[PDB]
């Protein structure tokens, strides 16, 4: 039990005469606050609010020469309740609408005073970081989202952020299986943004999310396309007696309206047509013009006619195919 008393006296010695107000090496070179992240999971991507909920094992290791011990050849890992008694980087996430550290069972948090002095401080954080969504190519979009770590009150003179490990500082991203997204790539940047007061440190973790078209091609595009095909069926019916053709044509726009109404619930209200509303409206225009084609041919016949029928029949599939080709080419790239 001698080691128990030794650890007790050493911890008491360390925490005695410790000023939380003073950063490590105050009045000296900047303290190199290395960082390390391990994304546990990306819970969801809220495009309506333009933000994503991310849960990560945020960690930040720095050196504090005061918290230096040599007698015990081991790495103490004190209770998480001691963090309030030690200096900590005043880190904040610039784009952070809402976040909290998990509390069950005890406050999820770590301290580990290594023998040299390196303090491995880590928290289990859930963040609803903000991410400006340019949903103009949606659903064929490549939304880019970032987390912006930055010190609040300290300038680059006093503090300095770096990824301990050039790229290994971020881990667990590959195993993440987003529901509607695929994390094509992630990059880590270490800038020094210059503000009015001075140059502040900055680390910008970035994820280049790619929308999973496999889900939405059947969820949204497939019904609309299928209904468009049904519109083509109208032309086959007849011209001598087309009272059925009018009914078949006019039902399709109602189907379109129902599909659109259900779709609008999930989407935001960005004014640009996006890749989705443009296609839905174009299909709406095509079916509407099919109804107008029926109107014109019916008026002319009751007012040569066979040629009008057949020319319309050939014209509609080819021009719709051109529309589909143009749209896919424009938005796929």
């Amino acid at each position: 039990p001698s080691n128990m008393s030794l650890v007790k006296e050493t911890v008491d010695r360390l925490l005695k005469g410790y000023d939380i107000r003073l950063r490590p090496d105050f009045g000296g070179p900047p303290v190199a606050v290395g960082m390390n992240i391990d994304i546990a999971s990306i819970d969801m991507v809220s495009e309506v609010n333009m933000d994503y909920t991310l849960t990560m094992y945020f960690q930040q290791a720095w050196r504090d020469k005061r918290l230096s011990y040599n007698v015990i050849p081991l790495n103490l890992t004190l209770d998480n309740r001691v963090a309030d008694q030690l200096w900590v980087p005043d880190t904040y996430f610039l784009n952070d609408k809402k976040s909290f550290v998990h509390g069950v069972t005890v406050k999820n948090r770590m301290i580990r005073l290594h023998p040299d002095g390196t303090v491995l401080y880590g928290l289990r954080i859930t963040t609803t970081a903000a991410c400006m969504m340019d949903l103009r190519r949606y659903p064929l979009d490549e939304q880019n989202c970032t987390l912006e770590i930055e010190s609040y009150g300290y300038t680059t003179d006093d503090i300095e952020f770096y990824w301990r490990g050039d790229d290994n500082a971020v881990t667990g991203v590959t195993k993440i299986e987003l529901p509607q997204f695929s994390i094509v790539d992630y990059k880590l940047i270490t800038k020094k943004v210059v503000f009015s007061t001075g140059s502040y440190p900055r680390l910008s973790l970035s994820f280049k999310l790619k929308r999973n078209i496999g889900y939405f091609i059947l969820q949204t595009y497939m019904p609309s396309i299928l209904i468009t095909i049904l519109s083509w069926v109208s032309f086959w019916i007849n011209y001598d007696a087309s009272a059925a053709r009018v009914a078949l044509g006019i039902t399709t726009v109602l189907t379109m309206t129902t599909i659109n109404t259900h779709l609008r619930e999930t989407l935001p209200k960005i004014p640009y047509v996006k890749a989705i509303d443009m296609y839905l409206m174009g299909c709406f225009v095509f079916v509407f013009m099919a109804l107008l084609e029926y109107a014109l041919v019916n008026y002319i016949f009751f007012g040569d006619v066979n040629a009008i029928d057949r020319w319309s029949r050939i014209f509609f599939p080819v021009v719709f195919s051109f529309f589909n080709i143009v749209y896919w080419l424009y938005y796929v790239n």
Binding site: D19, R21, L22
Partner: peptide, 30 residues
């Protein structure tokens, strides 16, 4: 020695300060 001066200044700042009253109460607007 720089820290000693700094920490002594921080110690002496709050001495005699009563946060219940705004600066210059009864003398001028804050």
């Amino acid at each position: 020695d720089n820290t000693t001066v700094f920490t002594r200044i921080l110690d002496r700042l709050l001495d005699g300060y009563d946060n219940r009253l705004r600066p210059g109460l009864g003398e001028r607007v804050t």
